[PDB]
């Protein structure tokens with residue numbers, strides 16, 4: 832519950848979502864990690880599909896997009912202790928991809944939390960309790976997305 836929320840919130844002090852250049856770069860590096868290490872997910876990215884980490888670094892789109900997804904991870908663990916808000920927000924995340932026809936097999940949402948934890952691991956050293964807490968948010972998000 833609230834200890835999971837607390838351990839997740841603090842590993843997130845290392846990924847900024849403010850206005851600085853730091854945050855713009857943390858949003859970009861996340862997409863660098865998925866494009867260079869999960870190449871199948873690049874195809875859901877409309878005419879950026881054969882992008883490399885390189886191409887991802889200089890396109891202004893990933894600076895904005897990176898901020899959209901880093902804010903959604905920060906919102907899912909600050910709402911974890913109120914499951915009604917947490918579940919409602921996960922449904923809206925689904926609805927917002929469906930809005931724009933980004934339809935994804937339910938096992939890509941599970942792959943995401945393996946990708947996020949690897950990305951944060953480059954940003955800070957996660958200890959086993961914190962890794963444990965991200966697994967639990969990941970697991971619950973995945974069941975909810977699965978309806």
Ligand code: HEM
Pocket residue numbers: 872873875876877896899900903904924927928931933935939940943
């Ligand atoms: C599970 C964690 C994820 C979160 C928290 C997340 C969050 C978001 C958010 C907030 C948006 C923006 C919607 C808007 O404009 O209002 C979005 C768009 C998008 N997401 Fe995700 N996303 C996730 C995973 C994925 C995955 C695994 C893929 C597939 C590679 C994906 C592909 C996209 C694409 C292509 C868009 C549309 C970009 C555009 O506007 O052109 N997302 N996502």
